[PDB]
Amino acid sequence: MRKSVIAIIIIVLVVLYMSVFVVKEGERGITLRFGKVLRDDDNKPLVYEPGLHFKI
């Protein structure tokens, strides 16, 4: 039960590191899943404020 725990920890950490992305102050981010953009608040395109956000 020693290889499995370190393996799950390291893969979880690398998955989280891949997931996180930061939008710089001067820019704004648009997210694309497959082709389309994410829609929110009654089918309105969403733009990311310059803050840390999580992507799949």
């Binding site: 694309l32 497959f34 082709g35 389309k36 953009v37």
Partner: peptide
């Protein structure tokens, strides 16, 4: 049982090669 394995392989190939994505600007 090899025929069942072949059927599983062909249906998996059918499912995997069928999916496609098109960009937002495109239709």
């Amino acid at each position: 049982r090899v025929v069942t394995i072949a059927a599983a392989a062909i249906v998996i190939i059918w499912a995997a090669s069928g999916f496609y994505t098109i960009k937002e600007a495109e239709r």
